[PDB]
Structures are given as C-alpha cells and as structure tokens.
Amino acid sequence: STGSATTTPIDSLDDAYITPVQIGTPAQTLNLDFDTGSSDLWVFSSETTASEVDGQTIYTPSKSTTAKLLSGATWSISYGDGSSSSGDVYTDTVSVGGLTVTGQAVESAKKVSSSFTEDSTIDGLLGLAFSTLNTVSPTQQKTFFDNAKASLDSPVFTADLGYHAPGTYNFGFIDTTAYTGSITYTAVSTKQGFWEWTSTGYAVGSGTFKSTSIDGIADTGTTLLYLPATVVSAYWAQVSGAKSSSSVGGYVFPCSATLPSFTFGVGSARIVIPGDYIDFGPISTGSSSCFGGIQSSAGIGINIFGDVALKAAFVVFNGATTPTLGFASK
C-alpha cells in the first residue's frame, strides 16, 4: 500500500504545515500537524475543556462506529516551545492520503495549553518520530507510520515541504519526479527516539564550506533551523545590522536586508537554503525589525533541522530495520 497527502502552510510565514487526516467511521477529517519530532497522534475532541477550544475541528468518538475506548490509558506531552496537552485514548481507523490503519491510537485531548487554543488552524498532531517516545501510559502505543509500515510497498515516508506553498507527504514510495539529482542517504541514531543524524558542515552565502560535524534532528514540527551558536553567529555576521536580541528572543535583522543563503552538508552532498527562506518577517506588525529563521540551539540541548532546512529538500525518512535519512535538492 501507499498514501499521498498534500500539506499546506498554516499562514504566510510557513509557521507550520497541516495535512488532512480521516479519523473514524464515517470519516471525521481533521487537519493535523505532522511532526517527525514526536510520537503521539492527538486531537482536539468532544472531550476537550470547552474554554480551551477556539475554532478547531474536533474528533467526536461517540459518532464513530469504529471508535473504542482504550481502557485505562492516558497521555500527557510537553513540547520544546513550552506547550502541552493531555487526555485519554481511543483506537479508531485513521487514513492519510488513501493509506488506512485500523486500530490506531487516537489520543483525545481533555486539556491543551493556550498556544494550541490560540491556533485555530491546527486540530492536533500526528507524530512520526520513533514509537519509543510515545507518551501513552501504561501501555505505550505505536505511531501511524509504525502501524502502517509492514503493509507499505517500502517502509518509508517522505516530506516535501513547500516554501510559501503546499507540499506533499508520501507513505510507502519515493516519487522520483519530485527531486533533482540524486538522494544522499545518511546514518540515523534512534537512541533518543528522534530522526537524529550528523550534518557534514555548512556554508554562508557564497562562502567556503566549513567541514564540521553537526548532530541534529530532522523535525517537521519545528518551524526554524536551530544550530550551534558559533554557526549561527557566522551566518548573521553577514547581515548588516543583525543582532541577537534577548528581549525578542533571538536574532533579528533589518527588514531592509537581503539575506544570504545557508548551505548544509549531507555526506558529500549540499542542500542550499535560499536567503528568503530565512526571513520570518516583522517581529510585531509594522516593525522594521525582522525575525531570523536561523537561531541558536544553545539551551535547547539539541540541534534542530526544522522546516526552514527541510523545505529546501526532498527528505526520505527510511524506516527499514536500520533507519536512515535521505536528502535531495528539488
């Protein structure tokens, strides 16, 4: 089997991407944030505290003939941005782009933090990291990809995120028309439950490439590119007037600037992030100070290849017995 679904930016900055997902019988379609940095599929629901729901589409398990309470199971998650959610669990039929999993754990939110309430466009998350990170207790549950894996033509999914445009998540096959050149594959460590890999270095603009190992995760659920402070400083030094602002919470730059590209290494191959991808616009409406798309990972504890990086590539998440990651230009 295979599946193929379009993923759409939630706003003009590509702050995140939503992908339609069918849950239950008859289908209830919710727009979920596919997140290769976590492993829970959770939704706004008929059980979510009413004051915490504001415009989202909810899953109502009582209206699904295939929904079954997973008795005794609860979940609770916190993300890197300080947001959180928790609730109980149903199993139900879940389909993405024509690919159907029966008995998928659908984690129903009873509580969500304000960040989620405030974002009307995201109805929940669909985790695509390794199932070892799944928070369901007392019986840990499998991700959608984990459940689908054995049935897939090939045990892979791909992320093809657009810049200010829709893109595609495919399951079970590699679309050879979707990228240029060849795909370069690189080793993955699953020891922390992430799609963790080592970049071979970087360049700033037309500068010379610096060979240096940068361990990080491929995370579709993080907006920006978070790299070591040395690397980030080297980038922003090439932008007149750019500075790290403690009050704003990162590097800002004059909105009148032209940003240089940023290149990262995948083995001997190179992925170029155009300068425009690194512009996240005025820090506040009408401001001439713009927020940067490359930020320091210091104090996160891990480097994160988020959407800024990933949308510059066609990315293969290879879930073979020994997982790997592939990157191609496009």
Total structural domains in the chain? Answer: 2
What's the distance, Cα to Cα, between the start and end of the chain in Å? 25
Q: 173-205 b/e with 16+ CB inside 10 Å = b? A: bbeeeebeeebbbbebeeeebbbbbbbbebbbe
Looking at the structure, do residues 40 and 149 belong to the same domain, yes or no? yes
Single residue among 174, 202, 222 that ends a domain in this structure: 174
Q: Note if the bond before 26 is cis, omega within 30 degrees.
A: yes
Single residue among 174, 202, 224 that ends a domain in this structure: 174
3-state secondary structure of 105: strand
Q: What is the 3-state secondary structure (H, E, C) of 230-284?
A: HHHHHHHCCCCCCEEECCCCEEEEECCCCCCCEEEEECCEEEEECHHHHEEEECC
Looking at the structure, do residues 201 and 157 belong to the same domain, yes or no? no
Q: What is the CATH number of the domain that holds 25?
A: 2.40.70.10
Q: Which among 263, 262, 241, 261 has a CA at the least distance from the CA of 252?
A: 241
Looking at the structure, do residues 65 and 189 belong to the same domain, yes or no? no
Single residue among 114, 145, 174 that ends a domain in this structure: 174
8 Å CB contact between 218 and 266:
no
Q: Which among 124, 129, 174 has a CA at the least distance from the CA of 20?
A: 124
Q: Which residues, at least 6 apart from 59, have a Cβ–Cβ distance to it below 8 Å?
A: 23, 24, 28, 30, 43, 44, 45, 46, 106, 108, 123, 124
Residue span of the structural domain in which 309 resides: 175-330
Looking at the structure, do residues 181 and 90 belong to the same domain, yes or no? no
Looking at the structure, do residues 131 and 202 belong to the same domain, yes or no? no
Looking at the structure, do residues 251 and 291 belong to the same domain, yes or no? yes
Can you list the alpha helix ranges (DSSP code H) found in the chain?
114-118, 144-148, 229-236, 307-310
Looking at the structure, do residues 216 and 82 belong to the same domain, yes or no? no
Which of 35, 88, 160, 219 is an active site residue?
35
Which of 199, 261, 296, 297 is an active site residue?
199
Looking at the structure, do residues 52 and 158 belong to the same domain, yes or no? yes
Pairing mode, strands 99-112 and 41-43: parallel
DSSP H or E stretch at residue 293: none
Looking at the structure, do residues 201 and 256 belong to the same domain, yes or no? yes
Distance CA 330, CA 325 (A): 16
Looking at the structure, do residues 248 and 147 belong to the same domain, yes or no? no
290 phi, psi to nearest 5 deg? -110, 145
8 Å CB contact between 94 and 106:
yes
What determination technique applies here? X-ray
199 is catalytic: yes
Q: What is the resolution of this structure in A?
A: 1.5
Looking at the structure, do residues 226 and 321 belong to the same domain, yes or no? yes
Looking at the structure, do residues 79 and 182 belong to the same domain, yes or no? no
206 is catalytic: no
Tokens of 222: 């993080």
